[PDB]
């Protein structure tokens, strides 16, 4: 459903009025609510415990089609430009794409061969670095976060005596805003996520209806103004 | 928030304590009308309509400038009678036509007038020619003009 | 300050201009805002669903000073040149006691 | 989202949908509430028991991307400038960075080799110092906090007959304030954390909507709620 | 957050007014409430069962950073000046620092070697003094409280045939008051804990927000005046 | 806190925040309530079942520092002045100190050696005196209370063929009253525990806030509550 | 005794001085206080909001 | 505490029993004016 249909169905279900004599719900307001609704839907349908079915990304075909048009595969770029300091001795710092939302699969191609990357926790790092060998298994590599500046930088801790030739990242792309009209026309300099023009939704038509329903619920709870509703529907903000 | 209070406007009231003022009255208001005039705006605050100048066109058509300060007027049936001081002490007759006042000068001289003693008049209609205007100052003799 | 009102110009409705200033003061406070309406950005005056609503000003001495007292004088009025008829029906005052 | 976007969406969520039907909020107050919100979200999403999912820092990809832009790796500096008194005989005092929020991994490079540091409790210290050897294991080092003056000083208790050449600390950086406008323009002298100018959020866009919603709930509780609302919503402040 | 920010954010969240025409909340009152709030936060985050997470001093990094800027290490001074009477025959009385809040680690360096001190209960003393040897284990020393005069005195019951050369005490320093303004200006001789001037908070910025929220809750419950709220929030006074 | 600080913070907690919106309280009444509060806190924090944590005297460091400034070690004096009648044949009557609140450790030094005293119950006495030997174990001594006249007299039942040379008592001293002003100035003749002048709290500053809060609750119950409030709050008087 | 009141001095508000004595009495009692206001210390008269 | 009672000042009354006095009246007053003179102080006690 293109953005015009989004706004029209928002009108059908929320009873706001299109006339400017009685200011109803502005297109900026509906754009903001739809952006928040799609972000919430992504965060709830990704984590299995955020929805009512207990199913996350790859637990059913419907979730797969929901997240299909956000899955992106890109390469990591070496951070040798900045001579920063790492936490490990054998850590090659790599910069990730800017339009990153969630990482789901990482791989590194070394001279020995491709090795899937394991996101290791701060406790597992201390646990496995208190042992004799202090290296990963033959078919895996470690990854921890490091000093980042308006980006995301990762320390790729691969076993010594090896060199990193590539770093692929399969990730969920950051969803773009849902904007129904050029906001610069009536509204001076208002933006959603740095965008002022029409931004048609970049997601599958499967969850367009869920986004619309969530936006309508958020609009009703916002106009109600009750604190209880605000907290109850902020519970689903993650 | 927690609570609300509706306020109605039935007039304007003063002289009462702020702690014991009443919501149906206003404490002060400039250029408002709470009565239905030119529309059905009764009990609803509305603007006060503005004025419109009327020219004092003589029967010949030339403009008529009034000498100076006014002391009093008199509307007999449709003829307004102005008693004005100034350089001289003049008298006028204004008749309201469709868009202009047919202004005539009934006298211009030294009728002893003073701004401290304004005019108070009575006017009668006895026939089409005897339309009198009696007027009195607190200083000078009482006078008449047809 | 919730309040209904309508402004007209020779039979033609004007839903953009109702008032132009709001003085609110008491024994120890005095604040004022211009009651402007910006569609996208927050503004002192904003309308939705044919009911205007305005924020009571904050005292000029301290801009963080809300109007808080047992009673307060509230003054609506146009003080910019214009020639419109402004029917001003009612005015509700939301407060926290 | 930009700080202007933060304010406008905050007035679209709070203040009903920009109806001016709730207590008017200033820019300083909005900045304060957004700062409080970001601290609250950080503290709740680090501790697994503070959130609704039961997941902490590195228990899911979402938390990793949430805390990504706060992870900082820095070196500790020897505190030999002040001849203070230590609690242990073999303790080399080190000063931690000033912009420290939470420590998650610490390591020390000695002449023998790198040794992951274990934060030992006040009871575990007494338990392990009542034994014959009274030294750590071959591949670990101990750390306890000591006299600090407007900073954080740590006692590095490494095994005897060894020297410390480096002390690296991977820590969560203190978040910067969220300020929507130059506070010195309208307000005389007011600050959030010692800052008076505009301050963009130094976090990933993932938790920006969560921060906005938490700020909305805080505003609603403070400006439209009673004592019960404040007490109930202060539970999620830790 | 310096004390000015403390008061300003107290104003933002509690809606008290800064003007002296309408007396709102005095700076002395906010100082008192903040002092009580920080004391309560210390007592609740120290004891694991006082908070909602079940975590005390050294059960998480956040608690460690919370209590970092209070941990102090100091030496005990012999009480040979006063020839008082002890409860044990081999008890050397020692005076502790005046700015003592809570003890967490104690050690004594004798001619035999360093020995961690065990705080023994009044029942354990009778239990272990009803046995043949009546001495501690080879690697520990006992400690019990004795007659104290505006201080804290401890009987150091170390095994006989040994001499005490040092007595180190790692303890949580007594927090200083939080005062926003020189109280002597408007208020004649009011004090918080013997202090009348500005006393910037000596704790980490981590728990500044918790202190502020607790102070706001206490202020609301005090102005409410309800007995039920007073008892409910006095439950958290320990 | 000083007594003036006690009164001022009491009027900041009770009396709303110094709004004069609750029953006015005099200085004598405040002193009485503070004294009652300190006795209540002592009795509740000694008995583990009286508090909310389930911890008594020496079950945590906080309780130790709470009771630190009340622990007193004193010698018992032989009661040979009065030829009273004892219940046991080998009982040497001893008089305890007058400023005694609670006994926690008692010992006797005999010619054979020091022997920790066991407070035996009225039933355990009958049980152990119905046996062949009818004497304590080699390393303990018995104690039972007997006829006392405005004091405390104790029957020291030590094993026969032995003599008593010393009787040490480590006890909790009776707390002194908390008086804010010289009561003889305004009031004719009123005392708290036989004291009319200003009396600073003879306790550690740890429990001063707890005493203040308990006094506030007692004042609220007495001066703003009904019979139910008094009955409910009298439960915590023991 | 809760009560609203305001004192002025040539248009200028005075929020410090309202009354100076309070006699309350009955068939068998008679008391009086001076109604002073001390900002920090407790006093018979205190204003807030 | 438990209860409250608002009192208004509409004038001054005497000759009535204390047990049956009315809250809207004052029992005695010196140099007061309950009428709006020089200001809008009607029904509000003000100085003379």
Author numbering:
A (entry chain C), D (entry chain D), E (entry chain C), F (entry chain D): 1 to 238
B (entry chain A): 2 to 147
C (entry chain A): 1275 to 1371
G (entry chain A): 1275 to 1323
H (entry chain A): 2 to 49
From the paper:
At the end of the tail is a large hexameric assembly of the muzzle protein gp44. Serving as a platform for assembly of the large domain forming the distal part of the muzzle is IG2 (between residues 318–1021). This domain is formed by insertions into loops between IG2 strands E–F (residues 453–904) and G–H (residues 940–1012), with the E–F insertion making up the bulk of this region. As this domain adopts a fold with no significant structural similarity to known protein domains, we refer to it here as the ‘crass fold’. The muzzle is gated by a loop within blade 4 of the propeller. One role of the muzzle is likely to be the formation of this constriction, preventing leakage of DNA and proteins contained in the capsid and tail until infection is initiated. Owing to the restricted channel diameter above and below the gate, and interactions at the inter-subunit interfaces, opening it would require conformational rearrangements of the IG and crass domains. The crass domain, owing to its location on the tail tip and the presence of multiple exposed surface loops, is likely to have a role in contacting the cell surface, thus initiating these conformational changes. A further region of density inside the tail was observed at its distal end, next to the ring-joining domain of the muzzle protein. This region corresponds to 6 copies of a 14-residue segment containing an α-helix.
